[PDB]
Coordinates of C-alpha atoms and ligand atoms in Angstrom, one line a residue:
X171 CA -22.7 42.0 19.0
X172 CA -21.2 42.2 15.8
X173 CA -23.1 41.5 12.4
X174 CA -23.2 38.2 10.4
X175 CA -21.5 38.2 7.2
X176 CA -23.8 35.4 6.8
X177 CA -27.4 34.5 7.9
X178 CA -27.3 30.5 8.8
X179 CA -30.2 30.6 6.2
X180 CA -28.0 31.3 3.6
X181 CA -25.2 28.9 4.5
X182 CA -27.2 26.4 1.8
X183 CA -27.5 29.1 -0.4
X184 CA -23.5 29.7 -0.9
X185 CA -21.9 26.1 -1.8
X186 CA -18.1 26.5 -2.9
X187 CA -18.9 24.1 -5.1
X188 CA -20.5 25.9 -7.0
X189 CA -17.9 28.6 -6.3
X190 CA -15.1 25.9 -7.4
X191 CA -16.6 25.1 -10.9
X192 CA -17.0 28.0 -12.1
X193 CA -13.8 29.7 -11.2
X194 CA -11.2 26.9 -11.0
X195 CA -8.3 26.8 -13.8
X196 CA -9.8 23.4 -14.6
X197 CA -7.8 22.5 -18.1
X198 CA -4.6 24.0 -16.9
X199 CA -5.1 22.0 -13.0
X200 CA -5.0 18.4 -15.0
X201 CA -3.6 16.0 -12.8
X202 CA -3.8 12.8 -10.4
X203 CA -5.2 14.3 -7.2
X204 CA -9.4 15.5 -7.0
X205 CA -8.1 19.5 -8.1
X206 CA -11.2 20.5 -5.3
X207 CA -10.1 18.5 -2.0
X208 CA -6.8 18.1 0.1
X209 CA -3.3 17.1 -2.2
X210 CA -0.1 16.8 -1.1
X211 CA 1.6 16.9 -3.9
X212 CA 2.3 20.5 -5.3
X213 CA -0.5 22.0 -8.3
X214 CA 0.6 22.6 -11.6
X215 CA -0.8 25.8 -12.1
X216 CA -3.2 28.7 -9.7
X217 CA -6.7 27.5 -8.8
X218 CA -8.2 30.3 -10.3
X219 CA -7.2 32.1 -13.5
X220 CA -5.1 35.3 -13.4
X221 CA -4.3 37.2 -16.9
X222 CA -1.0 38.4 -14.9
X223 CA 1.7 35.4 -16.1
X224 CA 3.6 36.5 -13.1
X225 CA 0.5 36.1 -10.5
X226 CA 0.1 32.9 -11.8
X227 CA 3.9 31.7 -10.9
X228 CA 2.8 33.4 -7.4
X229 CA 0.0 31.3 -6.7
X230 CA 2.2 28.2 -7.8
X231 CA 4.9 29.2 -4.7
X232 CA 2.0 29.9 -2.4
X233 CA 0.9 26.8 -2.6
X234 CA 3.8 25.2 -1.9
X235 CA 4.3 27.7 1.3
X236 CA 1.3 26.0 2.4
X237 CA 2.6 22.5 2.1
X238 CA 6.2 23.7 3.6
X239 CA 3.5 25.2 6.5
X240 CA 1.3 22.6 6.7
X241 CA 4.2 19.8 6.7
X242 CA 6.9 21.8 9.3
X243 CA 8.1 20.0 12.5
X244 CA 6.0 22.1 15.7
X245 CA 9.2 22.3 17.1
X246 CA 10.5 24.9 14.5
X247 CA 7.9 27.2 16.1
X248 CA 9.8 27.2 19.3
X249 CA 13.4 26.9 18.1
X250 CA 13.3 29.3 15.7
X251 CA 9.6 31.2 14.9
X252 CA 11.5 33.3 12.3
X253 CA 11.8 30.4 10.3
X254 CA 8.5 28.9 10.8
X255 CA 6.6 31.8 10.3
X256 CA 8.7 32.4 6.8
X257 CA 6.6 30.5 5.0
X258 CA 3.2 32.6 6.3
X259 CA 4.9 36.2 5.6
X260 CA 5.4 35.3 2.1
X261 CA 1.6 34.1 1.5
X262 CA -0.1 37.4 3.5
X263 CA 2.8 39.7 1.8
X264 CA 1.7 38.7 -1.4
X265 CA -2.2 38.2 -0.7
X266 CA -2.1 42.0 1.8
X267 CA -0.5 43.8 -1.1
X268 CA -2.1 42.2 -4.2
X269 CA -5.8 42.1 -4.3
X270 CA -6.2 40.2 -7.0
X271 CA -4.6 37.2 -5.3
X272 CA -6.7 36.9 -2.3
X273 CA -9.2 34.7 -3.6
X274 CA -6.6 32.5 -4.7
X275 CA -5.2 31.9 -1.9
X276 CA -8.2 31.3 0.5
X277 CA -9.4 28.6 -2.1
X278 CA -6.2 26.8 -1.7
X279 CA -6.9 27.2 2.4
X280 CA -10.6 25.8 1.7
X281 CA -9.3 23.0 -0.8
X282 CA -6.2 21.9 1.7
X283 CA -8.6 22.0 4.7
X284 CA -11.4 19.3 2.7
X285 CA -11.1 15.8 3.2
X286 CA -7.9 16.1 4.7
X287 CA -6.9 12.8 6.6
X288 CA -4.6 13.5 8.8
X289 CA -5.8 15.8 11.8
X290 CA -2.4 17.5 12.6
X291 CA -2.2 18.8 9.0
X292 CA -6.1 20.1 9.4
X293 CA -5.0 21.6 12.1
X294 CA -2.5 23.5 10.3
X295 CA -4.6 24.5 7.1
X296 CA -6.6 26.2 10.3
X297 CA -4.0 28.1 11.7
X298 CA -3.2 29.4 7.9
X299 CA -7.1 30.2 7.7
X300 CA -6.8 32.2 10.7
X301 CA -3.6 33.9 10.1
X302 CA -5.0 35.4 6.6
X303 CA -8.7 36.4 8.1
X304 CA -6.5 38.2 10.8
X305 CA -4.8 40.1 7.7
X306 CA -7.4 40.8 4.5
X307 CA -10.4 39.3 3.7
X308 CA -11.6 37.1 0.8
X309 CA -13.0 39.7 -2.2
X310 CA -17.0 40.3 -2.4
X311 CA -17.0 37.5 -4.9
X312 CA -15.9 34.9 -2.5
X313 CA -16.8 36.0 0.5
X314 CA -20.0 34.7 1.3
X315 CA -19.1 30.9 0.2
X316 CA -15.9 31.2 2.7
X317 CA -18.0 33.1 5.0
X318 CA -20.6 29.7 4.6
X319 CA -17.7 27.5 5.2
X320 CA -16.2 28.4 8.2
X321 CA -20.0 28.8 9.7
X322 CA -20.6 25.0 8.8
X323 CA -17.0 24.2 10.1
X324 CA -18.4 25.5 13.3
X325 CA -21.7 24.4 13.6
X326 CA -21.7 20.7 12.3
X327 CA -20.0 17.7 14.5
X328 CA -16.0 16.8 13.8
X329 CA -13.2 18.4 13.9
X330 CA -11.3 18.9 16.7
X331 CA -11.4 21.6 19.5
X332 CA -8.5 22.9 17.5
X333 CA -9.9 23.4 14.5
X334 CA -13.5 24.7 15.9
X335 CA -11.6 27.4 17.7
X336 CA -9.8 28.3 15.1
X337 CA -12.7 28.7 12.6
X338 CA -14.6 30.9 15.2
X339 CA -12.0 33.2 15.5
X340 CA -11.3 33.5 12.2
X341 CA -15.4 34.3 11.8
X342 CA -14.8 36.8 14.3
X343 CA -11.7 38.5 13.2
X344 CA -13.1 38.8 9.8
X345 CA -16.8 40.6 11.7
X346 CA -13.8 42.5 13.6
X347 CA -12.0 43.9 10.1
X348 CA -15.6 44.7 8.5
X349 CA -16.3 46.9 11.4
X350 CA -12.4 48.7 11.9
X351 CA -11.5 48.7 8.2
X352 CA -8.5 47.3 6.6
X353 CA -5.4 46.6 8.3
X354 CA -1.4 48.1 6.9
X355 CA 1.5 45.3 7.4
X356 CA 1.7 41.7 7.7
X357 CA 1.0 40.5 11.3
X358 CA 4.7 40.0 13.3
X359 CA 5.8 37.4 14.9
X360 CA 4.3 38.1 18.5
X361 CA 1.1 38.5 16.5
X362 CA 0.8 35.5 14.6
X363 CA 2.3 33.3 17.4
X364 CA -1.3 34.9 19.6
X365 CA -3.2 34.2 16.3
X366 CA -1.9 30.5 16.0
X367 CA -2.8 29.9 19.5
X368 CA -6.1 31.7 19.6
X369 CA -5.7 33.9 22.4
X370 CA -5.2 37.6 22.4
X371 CA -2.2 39.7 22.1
X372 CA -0.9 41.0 25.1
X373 CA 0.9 45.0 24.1
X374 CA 2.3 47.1 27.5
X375 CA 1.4 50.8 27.5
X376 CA 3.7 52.9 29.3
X377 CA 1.5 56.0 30.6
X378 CA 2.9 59.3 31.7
X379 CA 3.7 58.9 35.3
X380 CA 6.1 56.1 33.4
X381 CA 3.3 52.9 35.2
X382 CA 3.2 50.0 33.1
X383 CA -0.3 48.8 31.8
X384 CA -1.3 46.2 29.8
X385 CA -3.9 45.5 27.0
X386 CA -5.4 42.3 25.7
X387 CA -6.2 42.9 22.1
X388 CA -7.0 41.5 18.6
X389 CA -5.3 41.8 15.3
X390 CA -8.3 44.6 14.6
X391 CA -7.7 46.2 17.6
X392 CA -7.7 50.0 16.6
X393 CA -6.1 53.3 18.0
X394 CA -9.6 54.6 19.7
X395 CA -10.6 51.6 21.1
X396 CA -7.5 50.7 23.0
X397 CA -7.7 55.0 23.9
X398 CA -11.1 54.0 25.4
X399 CA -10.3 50.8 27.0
X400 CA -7.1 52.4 29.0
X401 CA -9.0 55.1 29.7
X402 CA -11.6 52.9 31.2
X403 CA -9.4 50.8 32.9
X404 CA -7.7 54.0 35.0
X405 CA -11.1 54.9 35.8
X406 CA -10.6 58.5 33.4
X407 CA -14.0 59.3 31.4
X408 CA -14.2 56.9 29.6
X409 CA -14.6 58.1 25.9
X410 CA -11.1 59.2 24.5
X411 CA -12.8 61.7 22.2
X412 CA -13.8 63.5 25.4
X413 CA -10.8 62.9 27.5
X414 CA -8.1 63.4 24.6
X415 CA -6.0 61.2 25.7
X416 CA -4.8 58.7 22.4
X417 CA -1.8 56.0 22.2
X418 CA 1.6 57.2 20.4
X419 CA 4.0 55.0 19.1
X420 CA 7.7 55.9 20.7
X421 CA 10.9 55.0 19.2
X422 CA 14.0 55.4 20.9
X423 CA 12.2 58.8 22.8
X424 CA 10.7 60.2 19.1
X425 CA 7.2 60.2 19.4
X426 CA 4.8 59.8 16.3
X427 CA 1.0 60.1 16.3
X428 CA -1.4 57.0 15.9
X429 CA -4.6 57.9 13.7
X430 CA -8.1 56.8 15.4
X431 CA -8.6 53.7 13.0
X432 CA -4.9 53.3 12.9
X433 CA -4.1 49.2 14.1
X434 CA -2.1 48.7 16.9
X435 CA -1.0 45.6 15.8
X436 CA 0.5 47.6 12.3
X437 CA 2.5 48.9 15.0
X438 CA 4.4 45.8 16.6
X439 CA 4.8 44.7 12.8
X440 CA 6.6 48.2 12.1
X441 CA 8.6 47.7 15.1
X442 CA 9.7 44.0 13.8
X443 CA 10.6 45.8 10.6
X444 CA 12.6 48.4 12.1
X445 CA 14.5 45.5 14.3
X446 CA 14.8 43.9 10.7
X447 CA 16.2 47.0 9.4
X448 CA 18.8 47.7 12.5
X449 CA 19.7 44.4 12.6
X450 CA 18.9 45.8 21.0
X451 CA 18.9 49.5 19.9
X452 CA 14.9 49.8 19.3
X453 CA 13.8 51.7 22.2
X454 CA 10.0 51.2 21.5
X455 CA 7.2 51.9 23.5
X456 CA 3.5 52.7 23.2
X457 CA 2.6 55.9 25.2
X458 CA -0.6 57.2 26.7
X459 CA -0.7 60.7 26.4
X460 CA -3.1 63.6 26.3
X461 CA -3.3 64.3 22.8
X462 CA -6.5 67.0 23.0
X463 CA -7.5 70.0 25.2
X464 CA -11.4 70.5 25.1
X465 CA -13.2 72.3 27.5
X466 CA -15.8 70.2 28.0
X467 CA -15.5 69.5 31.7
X468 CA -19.4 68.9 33.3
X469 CA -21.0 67.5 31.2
X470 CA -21.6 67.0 35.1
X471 CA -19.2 64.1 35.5
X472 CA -17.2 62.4 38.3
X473 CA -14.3 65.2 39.8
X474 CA -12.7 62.3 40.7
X475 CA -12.4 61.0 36.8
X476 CA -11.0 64.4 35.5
X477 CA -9.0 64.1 38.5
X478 CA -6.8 61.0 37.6
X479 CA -6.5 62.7 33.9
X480 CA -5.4 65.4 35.8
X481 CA -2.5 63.9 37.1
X482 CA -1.7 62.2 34.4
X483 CA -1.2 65.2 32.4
X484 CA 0.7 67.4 34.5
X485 CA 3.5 64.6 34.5
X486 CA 3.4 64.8 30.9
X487 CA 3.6 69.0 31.2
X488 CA 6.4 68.8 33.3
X489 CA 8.6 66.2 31.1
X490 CA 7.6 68.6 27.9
X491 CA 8.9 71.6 29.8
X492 CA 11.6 70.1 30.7
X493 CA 12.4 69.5 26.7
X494 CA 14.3 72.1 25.0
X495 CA 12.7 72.4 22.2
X496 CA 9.7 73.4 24.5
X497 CA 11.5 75.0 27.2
X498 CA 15.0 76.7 27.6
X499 CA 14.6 78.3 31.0
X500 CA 16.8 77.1 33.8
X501 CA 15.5 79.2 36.6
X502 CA 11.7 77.7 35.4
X503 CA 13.0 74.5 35.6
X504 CA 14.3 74.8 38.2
X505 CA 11.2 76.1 40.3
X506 CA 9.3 73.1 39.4
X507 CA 12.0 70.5 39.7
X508 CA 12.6 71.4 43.0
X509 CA 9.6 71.3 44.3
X510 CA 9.1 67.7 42.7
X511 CA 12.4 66.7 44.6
X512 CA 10.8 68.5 48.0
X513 CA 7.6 66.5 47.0
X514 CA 9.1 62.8 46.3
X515 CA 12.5 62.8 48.6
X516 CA 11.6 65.7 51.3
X517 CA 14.1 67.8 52.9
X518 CA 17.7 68.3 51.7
X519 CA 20.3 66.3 53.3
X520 CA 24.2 66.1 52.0
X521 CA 23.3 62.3 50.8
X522 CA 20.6 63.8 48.9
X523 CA 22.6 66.0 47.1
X524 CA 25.6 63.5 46.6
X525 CA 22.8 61.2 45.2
X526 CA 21.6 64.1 42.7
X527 CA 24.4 64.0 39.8
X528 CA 23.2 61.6 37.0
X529 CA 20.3 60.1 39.3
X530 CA 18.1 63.5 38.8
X531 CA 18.7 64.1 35.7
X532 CA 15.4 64.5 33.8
X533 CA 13.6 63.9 37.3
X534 CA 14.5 67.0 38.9
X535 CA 16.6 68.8 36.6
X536 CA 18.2 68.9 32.9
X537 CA 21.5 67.7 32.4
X538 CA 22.3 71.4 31.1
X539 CA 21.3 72.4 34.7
X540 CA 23.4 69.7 36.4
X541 CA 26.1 70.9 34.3
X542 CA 25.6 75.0 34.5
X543 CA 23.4 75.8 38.1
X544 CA 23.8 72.8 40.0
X545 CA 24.6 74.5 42.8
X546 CA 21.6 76.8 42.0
X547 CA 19.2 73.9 42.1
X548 CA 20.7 72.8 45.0
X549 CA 20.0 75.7 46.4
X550 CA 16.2 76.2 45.8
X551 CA 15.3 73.2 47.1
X552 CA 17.6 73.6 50.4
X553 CA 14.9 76.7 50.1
X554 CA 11.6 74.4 50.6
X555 CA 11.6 74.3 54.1
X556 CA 10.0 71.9 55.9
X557 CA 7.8 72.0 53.0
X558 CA 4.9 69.1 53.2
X559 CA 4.4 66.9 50.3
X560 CA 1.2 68.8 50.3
X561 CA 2.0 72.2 50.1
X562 CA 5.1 71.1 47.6
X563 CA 2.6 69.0 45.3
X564 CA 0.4 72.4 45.6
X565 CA 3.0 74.7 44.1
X566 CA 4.4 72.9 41.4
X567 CA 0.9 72.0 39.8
X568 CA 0.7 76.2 40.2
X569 CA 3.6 76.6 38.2
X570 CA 2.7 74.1 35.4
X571 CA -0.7 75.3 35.0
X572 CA 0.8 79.0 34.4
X573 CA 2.6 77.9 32.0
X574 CA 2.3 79.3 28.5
X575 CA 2.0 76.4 27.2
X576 CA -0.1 74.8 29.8
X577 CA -3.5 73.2 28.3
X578 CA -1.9 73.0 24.5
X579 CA -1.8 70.1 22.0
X580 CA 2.2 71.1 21.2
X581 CA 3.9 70.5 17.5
X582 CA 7.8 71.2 17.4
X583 CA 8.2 73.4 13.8
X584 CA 10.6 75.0 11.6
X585 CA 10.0 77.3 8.6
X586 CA 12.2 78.5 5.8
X587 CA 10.2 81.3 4.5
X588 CA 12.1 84.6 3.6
X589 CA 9.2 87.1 4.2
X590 CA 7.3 86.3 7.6
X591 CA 8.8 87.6 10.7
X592 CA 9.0 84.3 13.2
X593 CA 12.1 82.8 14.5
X594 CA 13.3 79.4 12.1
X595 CA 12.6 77.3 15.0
X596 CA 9.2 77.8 16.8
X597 CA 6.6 75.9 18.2
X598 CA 2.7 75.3 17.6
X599 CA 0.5 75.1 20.5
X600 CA -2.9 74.6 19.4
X601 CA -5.9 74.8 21.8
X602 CA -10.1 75.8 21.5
X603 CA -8.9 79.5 20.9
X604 CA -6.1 78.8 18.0
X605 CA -3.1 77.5 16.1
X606 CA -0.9 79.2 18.2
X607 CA 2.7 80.6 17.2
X608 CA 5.0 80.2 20.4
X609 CA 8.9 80.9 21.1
X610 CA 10.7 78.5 23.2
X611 CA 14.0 80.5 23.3
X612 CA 11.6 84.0 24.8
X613 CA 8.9 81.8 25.9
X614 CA 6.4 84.4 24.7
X615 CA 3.0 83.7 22.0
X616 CA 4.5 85.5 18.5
X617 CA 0.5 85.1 16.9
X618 CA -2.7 83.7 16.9
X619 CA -3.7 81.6 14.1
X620 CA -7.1 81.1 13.3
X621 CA -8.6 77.4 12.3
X622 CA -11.6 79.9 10.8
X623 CA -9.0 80.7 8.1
X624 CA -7.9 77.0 7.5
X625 CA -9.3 75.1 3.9
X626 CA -12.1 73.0 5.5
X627 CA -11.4 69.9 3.0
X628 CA -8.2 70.7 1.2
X629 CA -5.8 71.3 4.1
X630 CA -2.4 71.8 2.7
X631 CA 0.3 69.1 4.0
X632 CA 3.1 66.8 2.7
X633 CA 5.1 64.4 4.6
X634 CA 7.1 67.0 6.4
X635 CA 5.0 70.4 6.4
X636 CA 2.0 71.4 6.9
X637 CA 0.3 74.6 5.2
X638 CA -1.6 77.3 7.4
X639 CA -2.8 80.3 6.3
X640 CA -2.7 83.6 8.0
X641 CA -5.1 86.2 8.5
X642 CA -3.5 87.7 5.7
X643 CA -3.9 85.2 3.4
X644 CA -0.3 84.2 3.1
X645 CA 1.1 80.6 3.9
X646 CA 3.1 79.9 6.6
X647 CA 4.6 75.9 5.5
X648 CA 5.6 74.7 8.9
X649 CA 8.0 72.0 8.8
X650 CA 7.8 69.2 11.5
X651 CA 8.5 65.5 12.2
X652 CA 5.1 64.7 12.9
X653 CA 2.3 65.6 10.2
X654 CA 0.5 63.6 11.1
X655 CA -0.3 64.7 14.7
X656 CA -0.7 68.4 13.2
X657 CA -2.8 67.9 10.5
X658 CA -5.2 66.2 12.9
X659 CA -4.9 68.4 16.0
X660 CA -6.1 71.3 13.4
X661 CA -9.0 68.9 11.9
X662 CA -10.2 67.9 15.5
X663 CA -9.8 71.0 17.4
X664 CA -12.0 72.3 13.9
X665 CA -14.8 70.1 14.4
X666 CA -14.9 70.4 18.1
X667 CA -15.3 73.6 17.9
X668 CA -17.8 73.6 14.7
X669 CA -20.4 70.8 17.5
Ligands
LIG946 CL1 -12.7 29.9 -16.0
LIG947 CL1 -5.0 38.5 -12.5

């Protein structure tokens, strides 16, 4: 399991008293209330001291967030969680983005959860304990008295069930965000509603044959290990490093790539941004895709695993030949769509055909083909005898895998260079044997890059290019939406190949 922040032998070692006195804004904290225990009535200045005037006011509103938390009517939460959860934003917006208020605000967590009379409100203090461990830890300098405080909170007799689970998890998620690294955003809603409860969140992933599968996860919940887990789950191999297969994030049918220590739960905050931003018309979904193309089949290993992966991918092949910017010819698309329709629907009848127009579209053919060679579709799959599903299946996985771009890692591009001879609009296809330059409008390979010529550790990029140099030593700056995804194809694909 994971490692202690804290021995239990040490638990006596680290007393926030000790903590307390020598940190606390003592002089300036004057006042009728023990500065060091449970108040209700709102502090006079920070806990600790800041230099920053204006991190001082902060800490001041924080605390009264915490009341305004700690005080709210429970059926806020259900009415209206925007509202009720307003209050928490503000303290982990502040406390994610400004390191130096951290430790403020988990001794005003520690201070509002001692000697506190009143259960409910305890209870409360809790949940605000467990939202902020699920969001940054305390700094090195605190650390190990909170960590001692939450392990007492657990161990010793008192509190209620409430409280007890929500000081584990909040030991836990803070062993969770040692291991996986920081997180990006403020939890969302959906998050902090699973945090608040103690229970995992529960994200869909939509996979390539379009199936529905879902994922209980935690706040530290990363890219690889949900990659591993779904791979797991649909009996693939199960490492994602071998596989290739990773989680994208899709909104409204643009896909973007998710890093390896990326958090899926910085996702579904982005997503509640986005909403925020739009004021309905966010489309998102999580995809499983196949990301990576190693040949590193057996490695002796189940036919029946690469098998389902397999499958998986050619669905994912078809719908990216099936995408203009991939693939513009009809009479291709048309060979494999038809077959699919032979495949799934089996021989033509005149209610087939009246049932094509709309229904097929992006099933069995592109709307420019329902448009342009409908009757031409039509017409090849009248052509598939008394075809079995079989023999159908059979033919279309022939004509996918002869693809040019079959067994690539693909990257839509542009370039607006003056003095290299490839088409404005072009697509990388990168595999084990190159960054490969590819037309979609001749469907023919222009060049082969080499990743042998590529800067080991000072890859050129931006936000909206990346920088790959030729054989002959000149740069081609390819433009795409997703730098991400290219700049890490070329880095894995490199050290694949270096092992
Ligand atoms: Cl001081
Ligand atoms: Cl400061």
């Amino acid at each position: 399991e994971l490692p202690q922040i804290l021995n239990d032998e040490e638990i006596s070692l680290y007393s926030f008293y000790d903590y307390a006195n020598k940190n606390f804004n003592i002089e300036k904290l004057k006042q009728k209330d023990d500065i060091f225990s449970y108040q209700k009535s709102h502090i006079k200045s920070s806990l600790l001291v800041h230099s920053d005037a204006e991190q001082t006011k902060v800490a001041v509103e924080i605390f009264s967030k915490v009341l305004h938390y700690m005080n709210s009517n429970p059926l806020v939460s259900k009415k209206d969680p925007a509202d009720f959860y307003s209050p928490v934003k503000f303290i982990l917006t502040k406390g994610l983005a400004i390191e130096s208020l951290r430790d403020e605000i988990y001794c005003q967590l520690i201070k509002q959860s001692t000697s506190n009379p009143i259960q409910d409100l305890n209870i409360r203090v809790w949940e605000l304990i467990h939202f902020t461990c699920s969001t940054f830890p305390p700094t090195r300098k605190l650390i190990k008295y909170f960590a001692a405080y939450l392990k007492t909170t657990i161990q010793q007799s008192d509190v209620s069930k409430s409280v007890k689970d929500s000081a584990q998890a909040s030991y836990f998620i803070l062993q969770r965000f040692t291991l996986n690294g920081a997180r990006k955003q403020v939890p969302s809603v959906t998050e902090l509603e699973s945090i608040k409860e103690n229970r995992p969140i529960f994200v869909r992933i939509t996979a390539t044959d379009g199936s529905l599968k879902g994922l209980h996860i935690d706040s530290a919940t990363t890219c690889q290990e949900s990659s591993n887990d779904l791979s797991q789950r649909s009996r693939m191999r199960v490492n994602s490093k071998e596989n290739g297969f990773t989680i994208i994030e899709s909104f409204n049918g643009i896909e973007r790539d998710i890093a390896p220590t990326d958090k899926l739960c910085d996702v579904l905050s982005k997503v509640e941004n986005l909403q925020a931003t739009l004021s309905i018309q966010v489309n998102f979904k999580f995809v499983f895709k196949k990301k990576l193309f190693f040949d590193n089949i057996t490695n002796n290993v189940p036919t029946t695993s690469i098998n389902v992966e397999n499958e998986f991918y050619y669905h994912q092949l078809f719908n990216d030949l099936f995408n203009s910017n991939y693939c513009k010819d009809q009479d291709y698309q048309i060979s494999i769509g038809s077959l699919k329709l032979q495949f799934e629907s089996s021989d033509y009848t005149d209610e087939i055909r009246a049932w094509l127009p709309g229904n097929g579209r992006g099933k069995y053919f592109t709307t420019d083909i329902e448009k342009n060679r409908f009757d031409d579709f039509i017409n090849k799959y009248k052509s598939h005898k008394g075809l079995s599903p079989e023999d159908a299946k059979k033919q279309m996985v022939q004509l996918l895998e002869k693809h040019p771009l079959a067994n690539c890692s693909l990257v839509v591009c542009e370039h607006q260079s003056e003095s290299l001879p490839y088409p404005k609009n072009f697509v990388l296809a990168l595999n084990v044997n190159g960054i490969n330059i590819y037309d979609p409008a001749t469907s023919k390979m222009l060049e082969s890059v080499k990743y042998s010529n590529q800067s080991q550790q000072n890859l050129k990029s931006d936000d909206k290019s990346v920088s790959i140099i030729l054989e002959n030593k000149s740069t081609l700056q390819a433009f795409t939406g997703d730098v991400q995804k290219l700049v890490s194809l070329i880095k894995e694909y490199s050290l694949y190949l270096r092992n």
